[PDB]
RNA sequence: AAUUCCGAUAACGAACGAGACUCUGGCAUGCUAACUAGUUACGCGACCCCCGAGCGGUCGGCGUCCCCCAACUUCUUAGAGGGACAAGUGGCGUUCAGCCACCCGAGAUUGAGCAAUAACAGGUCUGUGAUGCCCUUAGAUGUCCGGGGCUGCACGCGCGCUACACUGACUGGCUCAGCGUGUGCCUACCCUACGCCGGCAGGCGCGGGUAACCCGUUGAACCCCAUUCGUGAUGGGGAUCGGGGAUUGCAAUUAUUCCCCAUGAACGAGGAAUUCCCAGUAAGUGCGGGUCAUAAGCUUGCGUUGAUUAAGUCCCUGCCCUUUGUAC
RNA sequence: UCAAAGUUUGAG
């Protein structure tokens, strides 16, 4: 039972938790202080967000490989209330997507592929697929 | 006419009202609780989450926008 | 010899290309089971054909589907079409034309859209208004 | 599931209409009643096509109203399901039967058409088409709910459920059922 | 006393602004009896109006 | 037919109502008792059928 | 839980204890949902608490972070008054202090009879927006 | 729908318009087709690591790594054909022209473009090395350089955006488009992947792209899914203004744009009045092109989500024909 | 099977 086979919401939850239990990701010093994009009015409520984003990042990489930072921004994109002028797309934070990718690099979940960007790595492919199995054996529901 | 001043508390007489009355409604939504009592809305929601973990009210549905609960499940 | 039938469904600009196959009944789309796809309020929609025919018919028929284009709701409505068309195609070509007709009847009496496409498509804007038929506000005085 | 379709949950069969007139323009079972109240469904082709559309989907579409909620059908489907879930808790019986009963006793039976009459506007009262009574009922009550649910801590769904219940019952408490009796009464006042 | 009345023949769309269909009706209780009256909304040959009054019967308007 | 069902008399002929309205020109022309006509038509003094 | 404060008086402003804490603080001039949330996250507070809980040591602890953001690693950027002309300081101002800083800037330019000053003085639109049509009071 | 037809007939036979036409949209497991499409299902030739299920085989999943001496054209692109004509059945109709319904299947009706005669003293002499007359013509009404101004604000109006929140807001997460456009230029420059630096605006390195080749499976928004908030001008709203920071530029002060913190106004759905619109339409929603060193609250296109209501009438507002009256 | 609806550069 691979990860595609699973309800991706409840996956990234266990992935992040997995990444928390391991306790060797590398969350930077800002974390608390930083917004997460020019979109956002605020920072995240979930204080351990980094664990969550890494997961989503790794779980994307399982799905579409070779995805650089630029790639990551466009994925982590959305609406930009410009107040009294109308709304637009805004690209997510470069650095948080760079740091996540460098943090998953240090774990050896990911590796920089030929033709640029990151692809998630075999030893990584293990882990995501492992926790997919976990979720599928949560219960018949 | 309309001005409403809601509670944000574990405030004795209400707390008795929840734990006595609330589990013998057929609709137990925080909206229904907030109207009955003068309880905030956030307060209500959490209270109804406490009662669920206690087991005194059934879960119907637990959706983004609206949570539905029920009477104990009598027999 | 293999019993392969590539068929497509359609809605707006979504091409769902189901692919019926001499298999053991999967029915999974892009690369994951029908139980997700994940607009999810529109799940029953893309179960309908399977519920209306029963697993008996799909049983020994594996269906891989690929979608692209359109929006979420369309895409569904395309695959919805696709597989139920594709099954009908499968039965025609390998099973028997009495069975095809039996099925086709049981799809139509529910809904004509499960096989026949909406020729409807987004109608072009003409200047002097924001859309097609609507015009911009006239001032007068 | 193959022989009989439910509505996700609810029973389609054993939903009895009473008024032999809404009968045929309430579409809750010919046999054809569906799983979901979504459906691409081009029932705006010809004049009466609309009537063979299922009443729940008709309601669903109506719900989806005012600026923001334009073409937000899921948004509104979710509502319809929750209202129904609330109805089954509160009232019991099929929420489809209750919805139907609203439609029956909620839209007017007579109405006042604006005829010219010289120049200063004085109407004459007329009957209403069965389809017109269902259209009204549908939108009246759907609007009723929505109008209630603005600045109050109450779910659309919940108010939608409460309206459908107090319309199904001759309550004089639904916005619709009250609105219905107004019309008729005016309608009488220039018959 | 409410009476149901089956619609036998749409006559023609009257009303000021084009609205109230002039409509010939059978009377359901006793089909022998038949009024003509004006109706709002889309009507068609064969369906049922609920008339509250049943002794009024319009003509030109 | 309402009346002939609720008659005392078996059969009964039912009477009529004889009225010689006079109209002034305006009043005719207004209530459409008489239109205007073309130069040809004006001359042709047959009643309408 | 917690049966105490409910209403709160800090830094000459009030605060609703009955409000949630991040969104309660913001009632002080010179702190917004950003800076509050930060100031609390440095303080290490169960920010799902209402402000009508929260021990008086904690509200002191917050205030100290709030007044002294740079000592508690609330960085450059998150500071309304950076490199402030009158002395080489970069910091956050709070309460009536803020308003006084503001008045000292509009004074400064009024004293310089600067174009901006003058348009403040005259009570106009200052950030060269058009005014034929708008801001009529 | 049509001065479109049937028919009557001091008219007969013609011409323009209308229609036909062109582009478009929707049908083609039929044809021609492809390494700048897909591949397509295979073969799985595999890799690949336990990648998973599983004691192990056999499956599930993609990433892809693939060429060509695999196999095609369902999806793709776009050619040439086809295809619907009110043709078929039943009504109604001088049993003509036609109209209604229904079968099969798009049901004559997808939507644009072009578009008569005769006008208007409509607009344009600031689009033109189209141009009459008139004016000026070196102390210029030619031209160029600097500077300002077209942005000025008791006020009145017109298109517009954003709102007034809970069907919502935020905060995370999941997840789907289509039309285009793009440097190496008519006078100086584009689109941008990837990797580092920065919270961010951006900065610095290397690459691809005159393009179905790279940007780019254009990983859009709304929508969906969990968050919190809780009817409080509240976390709705984001005007106003202070402080700093980025870029475009020869230069940005009268804030060029951009980011950050702080500030937090009116506004709780809007009088009388009136606009626009009937099907993938309105409305929502984003994304392209235009201008563009810098760049959209405008517009011109695109798709995505997707209704209520009509299928009618001349009440108003208008138009087209007939007869009539007219001191116009 | 009839409510109210007055006026219109001197500037060619």
For residues D149 and D168, what is the distance between their CA atoms, to the nearest angstrom? 19
Q: Give Cα G76 distance to the centre of its chain.
A: 15
For residues G114 and G105, what is the distance between their CA atoms, to the nearest angstrom? 11
Contact B22, B51 (CB under 8 A): yes
Residues in chain G: 137
- What is the number of CB-based contacts under 8 A between chain B and chain G? 8
Q: What is the token pair recorded at D38? A: 């979504």
Secondary structure of chain F in the HEC alphabet? CHHHHCCCCCCCCCCCCCCCCCCCHHHHHHCCCCCCCCCCHHHCCCCCC
Interface probe for D, chosen from E5, E20, E21, E59 (most Cβ of D below 10 Å), is E20
Task: Report the 10 Å Cβ neighbour count for A118.
Answer: 26
Q: Give Cα C116 distance to the centre of its chain.
A: 9
Residue G127: which region, alpha, beta or left (left: phi > 0; alpha: psi -120 to 50)?
beta
DSSP 8-state assignment for residue D28: S
Q: Which residues contact E10 (CB under 8 A, 6 or more apart)?
A: E21, E22, E23, E24, E43, E44, E45
Q: What is the token pair recorded at G38? A: 């930060």
CA distances to B7, G20, G43, G48, G59 from G52, rounded to whole Å, are 12, 8, 17, 12, 11
For residues A33 and A49, what is the distance between their CA atoms, to the nearest angstrom? 12
Over the Cα atoms of chain D, what is R_g?
17
Instruction: Write out the residue range of the structural domain in which residue C28 sits.
Output: 1-141
Instruction: Write out the residue range of the structural domain in which residue D166 sits.
Output: 1-191
Contact B58, B65 (CB under 8 A): no
In chain D, where does DSSP find H-type helix? 49-52, 55-63, 73-90, 95-104, 130-148, 156-168, 175-189
Task: Give the torsion through C-alpha atoms of G48, G52, G54, G59, to 10 deg.
Answer: 110
Contact D124, D187 (CB under 8 A): no
Number of H helices, E strands in chain G: 5, 4
Total domains in chain C come to: 1
Q: What is the token pair recorded at D22? A: 């809404």
A and G interact (at least 3 Cβ pairs within 8 A): yes
Contact between the CB of G48 and strand H at under 7 Å: yes
Residue with tokens 């920010």: G47
Residue with tokens 């037919």: F1
Task: Give the torsion through C-alpha atoms of D160, D161, D162, D164, to 10 deg.
Answer: 80
For residues G136 and G119, what is the distance between their CA atoms, to the nearest angstrom? 15
Contact C22, C61 (CB under 8 A): yes
Name every chain D residue with its beta carbon within 8 A of the beta carbon of B68: 82, 85-86, 89
- Angle (deg, nearest 10), helices D156-168 and D95-104: 60
The tally of CA atoms less than 13 A away on the side-chain side of residue C29 is 26
Q: Please report the sign of the dihedral spanned by the C-alpha atoms of residue F23, residue F24, residue F25, residue F29.
A: negative
Neighbours of chain G (3+ CB pairs under 8 A): A, B
Enclosing H/E stretch for G13: strand G13-15
- From B29, B61, B63, residue closest to D158, measured CB to CB: B29
For residues A78 and C141, what is the distance between their CA atoms, to the nearest angstrom? 42
Task: Report the 10 Å Cβ neighbour count for G112.
Answer: 11
Sheet holding C61-69, edge to edge: C4-11, C14-22, C61-69, C28-29, C32-33
For residues E46 and E31, what is the distance between their CA atoms, to the nearest angstrom? 13
DSSP 8-state assignment for residue D23: B
Q: Give Cα D88 distance to the centre of its chain.
A: 18
Enclosing H/E stretch for G21: helix G21-25
- Longest CA pairwise span in chain G (Å): 57
Contact C38, C57 (CB under 8 A): no
Q: What is the token pair recorded at D8? A: 């996700």
For residues C31 and C25, what is the distance between their CA atoms, to the nearest angstrom? 15
Over the Cα atoms of chain F, what is R_g?
19
Number of H helices, E strands in chain E: 0, 4
Residue with tokens 């987004």: C122
Over the Cα atoms of chain G, what is R_g?
19
D 4-33 near E (Cβ less than 8 A)? 19-21, 23-25
For residues D133 and D110, what is the distance between their CA atoms, to the nearest angstrom? 9
Domains belonging to chain B, first-starting first, are 1-75 (1.10.10.10)
Contact B68, D159 (CB under 8 A): no
Secondary structure of chain A in the HEC alphabet? CCCCCCCHHHHHHHHHHHHHHHCCCCCCCCCCCCCCECCCCCCCCCCCCHHHHHHHHHHHHHHCCCCCHHHHHHHCCEEEEECCEEEEEECECHHHHHHHHHHHHHHCCEEECCCCCEEECHHHHHHHHHHHHHHHCCCCC
For residues B44 and C96, what is the distance between their CA atoms, to the nearest angstrom? 61
**Nearest nucleotide, C1' to the C-alpha of D120?**
I3
For residues G11 and G96, what is the distance between their CA atoms, to the nearest angstrom? 9
Contact between the CB of G1 and strand H at under 7 Å: no
Q: Which residues contact B69 (CB under 8 A, 6 or more apart)?
A: B27, B28, B29, B48, B51, B52, B57, B58, B59, B60
Q: DSSP 3-state assignment of E18? A: coil
Beta bridge partners of E22: E12, E38
Which CATH number goes with the domain that contains C86? 3.30.230.10
For residues B43 and B40, what is the distance between their CA atoms, to the nearest angstrom? 5
- From E2, E43, E51, residue closest to D129, measured CB to CB: E43
Number of H helices, E strands in chain D: 7, 2
Interface probe for D, chosen from B6, B36, B38, B68 (most Cβ of D below 10 Å), is B68
Q: Please report the sign of the dihedral spanned by the C-alpha atoms of residue D87, residue D88, residue D91, residue D93.
A: positive
Residue G121, burial from CB neighbour count under 10 angstroms (0-12, 13-18, 19+): middle
Task: Report the 10 Å Cβ neighbour count for G72.
Answer: 14
Q: Give, as ranges, the nucleotides of chain I with any atom within 7 Å of a protein CB.
A: 1-4
DSSP 8-state assignment for residue D15: -
Closest by Cα among D63, D90, B43, B51 to B35: B43
For residues D119 and B69, what is the distance between their CA atoms, to the nearest angstrom? 58
Buried residues in A28-65 as b, exposed as e (16+ CB within 10 A): eeebbbbebbebeeebbeeeebbbbbbbbbbbbbbeee
Task: Report the 10 Å Cβ neighbour count for G36.
Answer: 21
For residues G110 and G121, what is the distance between their CA atoms, to the nearest angstrom? 7
For residues G118 and G129, what is the distance between their CA atoms, to the nearest angstrom? 15
Contact D175, D140 (CB under 8 A): yes
Residue contact A42–G42, C-beta within 8 A: no
Enclosing H/E stretch for C38: none
Closest by Cα among D151, D146, D141, D147 to D174: D141
Contact D123, D117 (CB under 8 A): yes
- From A33, A41, A47, residue closest to G78, measured CB to CB: A33
Contact C39, C72 (CB under 8 A): yes
Task: Report the 10 Å Cβ neighbour count for G136.
Answer: 5
| Torsions phi, psi for C39 (to 5 deg) | -60, -35
For residues D35 and C51, what is the distance between their CA atoms, to the nearest angstrom? 10
Contact A76, G68 (CB under 8 A): no
Q: E strands, E1-61, where?
A: 3-13, 21-26, 34-40, 48-51
DSSP 8-state assignment for residue C124: P
Query: How distant is C1' of H251 from CA of G125, in Å?
Result: 24
**Nearest nucleotide, C1' to the C-alpha of D157?**
H167
Interface probe for D, chosen from E10, E26, E39 (most Cβ of D below 10 Å), is E39
Residue contact D40–C41, C-beta within 8 A: no
Q: Which residues contact A86 (CB under 8 A, 6 or more apart)?
A: none
Total domains in chain D come to: 1
For residues G132 and G135, what is the distance between their CA atoms, to the nearest angstrom? 9
How was this structure obtained?
cryo-EM
For residues A137 and D117, what is the distance between their CA atoms, to the nearest angstrom? 76
For residues D81 and D74, what is the distance between their CA atoms, to the nearest angstrom? 10
Q: What is the token pair recorded at A17? A: 């938790």
């Amino acid at each position: 039972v691979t990860v595609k086979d699973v309800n991706q919401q409840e996956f990234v939850r266990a992935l992040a938790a997995f990444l928390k239990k391991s306790g060797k990701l590398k969350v930077p010093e800002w974390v608390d202080t930083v917004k997460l994009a020019k979109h956002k009015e605020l920072a995240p409520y979930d204080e351990n967000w980094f664990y969550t984003r890494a997961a989503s990042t790794a779980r994307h990489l399982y799905l579409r490989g070779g995805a650089g930072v630029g790639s990551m921004t466009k994925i982590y994109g959305g609406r930009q209330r410009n107040g009294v002028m109308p709304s637009h797309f805004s690209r997510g934070s470069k650095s948080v997507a760079r740091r996540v990718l460098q943090a998953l690099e240090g774990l050896k979940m990911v590796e920089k592929d030929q033709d640029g960007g990151r692809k998630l790595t075999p030893q990584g492919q293990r882990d995501l697929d492992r926790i997919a199995g976990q979720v599928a054996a949560a219960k018949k529901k | 006419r309309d001005k409403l001043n809601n509670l944000v508390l574990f405030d004795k007489a209400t707390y008795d009202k929840l734990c006595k009355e609330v589990p013998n409604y057929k609709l137990i939504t925080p909206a229904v609780v907030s109207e009955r009592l003068k309880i905030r809305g956030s307060l209500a929601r959490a209270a109804l989450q406490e009662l669920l973990s206690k087991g005194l009210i059934k879960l119907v549905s637990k959706h983004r926008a609206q949570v539905i609960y029920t009477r104990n499940t009598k027999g | 010899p293999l019993q392969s039938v590539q068929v497509f469904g359609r809605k707006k600009t979504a091409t769902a290309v189901a692919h019926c196959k001499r298999g053991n009944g999967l029915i999974k789309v892009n690369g994951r089971p029908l139980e997700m796809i994940e607009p999810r309020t529109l799940q029953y929609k893309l179960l309908e054909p399977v519920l209306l025919l029963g697993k008996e018919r799909f049983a020994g028929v594996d269906i891989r589907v690929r979608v692209k284009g359109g929006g979420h709701v369309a895409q569904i409505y395309a695959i919805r079409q696709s597989i139920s068309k594709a099954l009908v195609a499968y039965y025609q070509k390998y099973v028997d034309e009495a069975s095809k007709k039996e099925i086709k009847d049981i799809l139509i009496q529910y809904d004509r859209t499960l096989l026949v496409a909406d020729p409807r498509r987004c109608e072009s804007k003409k200047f002097g208004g924001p859309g097609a038929r609507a015009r911009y506000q006239k001032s007068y005085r | 599931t193959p022989d009989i379709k439910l509505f996700g949950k609810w029973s389609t069969d054993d939903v009895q209409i009473n008024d032999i007139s809404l009968q045929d323009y309430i579409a809750v079972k010919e046999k054809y009643a569906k799983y979901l109240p979504h459906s691409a469904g081009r029932y705006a082709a010809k004049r009466f096509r609309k009537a063979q559309c299922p009443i729940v989907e008709r309601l669903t579409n109506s719900m989806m109203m005012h600026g923001r909620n334009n073409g937000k059908k899921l948004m509104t489907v979710r509502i319809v399901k929750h209202a129904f879930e609330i109805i089954h808790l509160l009232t019991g019986e099929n929420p489809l039967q209750v919805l139907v009963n609203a439609i029956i006793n909620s839209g007017p039976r007579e109405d006042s058409t604006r005829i010219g009459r010289a120049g200063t506007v004085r109407r004459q009262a007329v009957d209403v088409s069965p389809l017109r009574r269902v259209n009204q009922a549908i939108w009246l009550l759907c609007t009723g709910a929505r109008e209630a649910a603005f600045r109050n801590i109450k779910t659309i769904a919940e108010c939608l459920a409460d309206e459908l219940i107090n319309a199904a019952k001759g309550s004089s408490n639904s916005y619709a059922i009250k609105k219905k009796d107004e019309l008729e009464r005016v309608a009488k006042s220039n018959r | 006393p409410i009476k149901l009345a089956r619609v036998t023949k749409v006559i023609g769309k009257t009303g000021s602004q084009g609205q109230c269909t002039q409509v010939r009706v059978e009377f359901m209780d006793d089909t022998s009896h038949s009024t003509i009256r004006n109706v709002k909304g889309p009507v068609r040959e064969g369906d049922v109006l609920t008339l509250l009054e049943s002794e009024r019967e319009a003509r030109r308007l | 037919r309402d009346i002939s069902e609720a008659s005392v008399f078996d059969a009964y002929v039912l009477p009529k109502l004889y009225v010689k309205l006079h109209y002034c020109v305006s009043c005719a022309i207004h209530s459409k008792v008489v239109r205007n006509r073309s130069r040809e038509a004006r001359k042709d003094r047959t009643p309408p059928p | 839980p917690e049966k105490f404060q409910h209403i709160l008086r800090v830094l000459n402003t009030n605060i609703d204890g009955r409000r949630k804490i991040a969104f309660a603080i913001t009632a002080i001039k010179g702190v917004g949902r950003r800076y509050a949330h930060v100031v609390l996250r440095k303080a290490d507070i169960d920010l799902t608490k209402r402000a009508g809980e929260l021990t008086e040591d904690e509200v002191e602890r917050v205030i100290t972070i709030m007044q002294n953001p740079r000592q508690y690693k609330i960085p450059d950027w998150f500071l309304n008054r950076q490199k402030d002309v009158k002395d080489g300081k970069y910091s956050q101002v709070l309460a009536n202090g803020l308003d006084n800083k503001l008045r000292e800037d509009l004074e400064r330019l009024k004293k310089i009879r600067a174009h901006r000053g003058l348009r403040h003085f005259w009570g106009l639109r200052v950030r060269g927006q058009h005014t034929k049509t708008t801001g009529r009071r």
